[PDB]
């Protein structure tokens, strides 16, 4: 059986430190992976994050400013879209905060290509 | 460039000079006022029978040392490159770096 330790206080241990394939009983395969803390995305370009949110294609090209950062730029379609509840507010805020997170982790001069 | 291009140029000029007189007379007949439109018609038909590479407007000034079809300078007959070598070496008479 895979190692299983219970979490203590705020967060759990890192029991599985490996990535192992397993043959599914019916058909196919699964893979157990080690737990992760930060799935930050500084390697991804900022536009690739707008593409990643699937609920945003419904509003590309609907912003009067073409280079619409969509935060407070006038005419940001997804701004009003989330104003009326078409978009999940939490998703919009998460998009913004991961963008600003990329600014914090762009300090490294190492390359990721 | 490719020897093919220089050969093309020399052929174009050697045909333009040949058919110069005929082309000039024919264009005269064409554009000439008072010309009988049948004569003008025969002239405009005959004109396109001559080798198309006889029209001087069909040539291209190439560098007379490399054949480069760009950066040409009529005063010297060289591309924008070889003029600089000839100048800096003191081959173009009275040519020097300008400053004002």
């Amino acid at each position: 059986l895979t190692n299983d330790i219970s979490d203590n206080s705020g967060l759990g241990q890192h029991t599985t430190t490996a990535a192992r394939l397993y043959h599914f009983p019916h058909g196919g395969d699964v893979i157990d992976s080690p737990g992760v803390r930060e799935f930050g995305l500084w390697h991804l370009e900022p536009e690739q994050i707008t593409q990643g949110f699937v609920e945003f294609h419904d509003y590309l090209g609907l912003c009067k400013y073409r280079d619409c950062k969509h935060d407070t730029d006038p005419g940001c379609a997804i701004r009003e879209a989330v104003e009326e509840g078409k978009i999940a507010e939490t998703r919009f805020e998460n998009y913004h905060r991961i963008l600003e997170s990329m600014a914090q982790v762009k300090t490294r001069k190492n390359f990721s290509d | 460039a490719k020897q093919s291009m220089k050969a093309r140029e020399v052929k174009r000029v050697a045909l333009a000079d040949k058919y110069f007189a005929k082309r000039a007379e024919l264009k005269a007949i064409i554009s000439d006022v008072n010309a009988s439109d049948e004569d003008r018609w025969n002239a405009v038909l005959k004109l396109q029978t001559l080798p198309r590479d006889s029209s001087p407007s069909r040539q291209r000034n190439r560098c007379r040392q490399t054949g480069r079809p760009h950066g040409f300078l009529r005063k010297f007959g060289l591309s924008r490159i070889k003029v600089r070598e000839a100048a800096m070496r003191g081959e173009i008479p009275g040519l020097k770096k300008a400053s004002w």
């Binding site: - | 040392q65 800096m88 070496r89 003191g90 173009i92 770096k97």
Partner: protein, 211 residues
């Protein structure tokens, strides 16, 4: 960074042109073409006469060519025979009555063209380059030169990565227009590749303008 051609910038101040004829724009280009091909023909034909410069001056009905060689007796051959031959040849190329009047260079070690082509001739004979350049500079300044800089660039000693090697001795003040700095460039084609040499030879400030 890059540096302006030293000979090309001192034409107004201390360096004379090498083709001093005059012609208006009507026949300027073909004059240049003719003199280019004639001087290239002469270079190809006098690859052993050790010519330094081929100055060309045209009278209205004639072409006059002055050769600067270190071996006058060579180019004139026997009883001025071959010089008359090549005079006929330049008459052919220019299509114009020609006259050839050779001129000698007394200090062949004080001619950037001469020493540069000698360096290249040594390189193509597969000799260690450092020896070549340092011998050249030593000879030059032994003949009383105010300064000399030699520079070689390319696959020196058949190097996989091309390097740049220079050697200066004396004074070589490129920025001073008043300076008599003779400069020329030569190339040597070896099995590894083409090696470029540049020679600056400063022979003293020329006080008192062009004349």
């Amino acid at each position: 960074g890059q540096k302006v051609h030293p000979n090309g910038i001192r034409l107004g101040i201390v360096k004379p042109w090498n083709s001093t004829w005059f012609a208006n724009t009507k026949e300027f280009a073909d004059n240049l073409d003719s003199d280019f091909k004639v001087r290239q023909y002469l270079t190809k034909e006098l690859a052993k006469a050790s010519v330094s410069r081929i100055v060309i001056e045209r009278p209205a009905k004639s072409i006059r060519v002055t050769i600067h060689t270190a071996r006058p007796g060579i180019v004139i051959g026997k009883k001025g025979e071959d010089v008359e031959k090549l005079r006929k040849v330049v008459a052919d190329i220019a299509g114009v009555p020609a006259q050839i009047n050779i001129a000698e260079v007394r200090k062949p070690e004080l001619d950037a063209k001469l020493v540069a082509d000698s360096i290249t001739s040594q390189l193509e004979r597969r000799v260690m380059f450092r020896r070549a350049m340092k011998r050249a500079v030593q000879n030059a300044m032994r003949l009383g030169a105010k300064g000399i800089k030699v520079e070689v660039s390319g696959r020196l000693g058949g190097a996989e990565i091309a390097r740049t090697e220079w050697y200066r001795e004396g004074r070589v003040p490129l920025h001073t227009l008043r300076a008599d700095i003779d400069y020329n460039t030569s190339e040597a084609h070896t099995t590894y590749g083409v090696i470029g040499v540049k020679v600056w030879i400063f022979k003293g400030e020329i006080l008192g303008g062009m004349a």
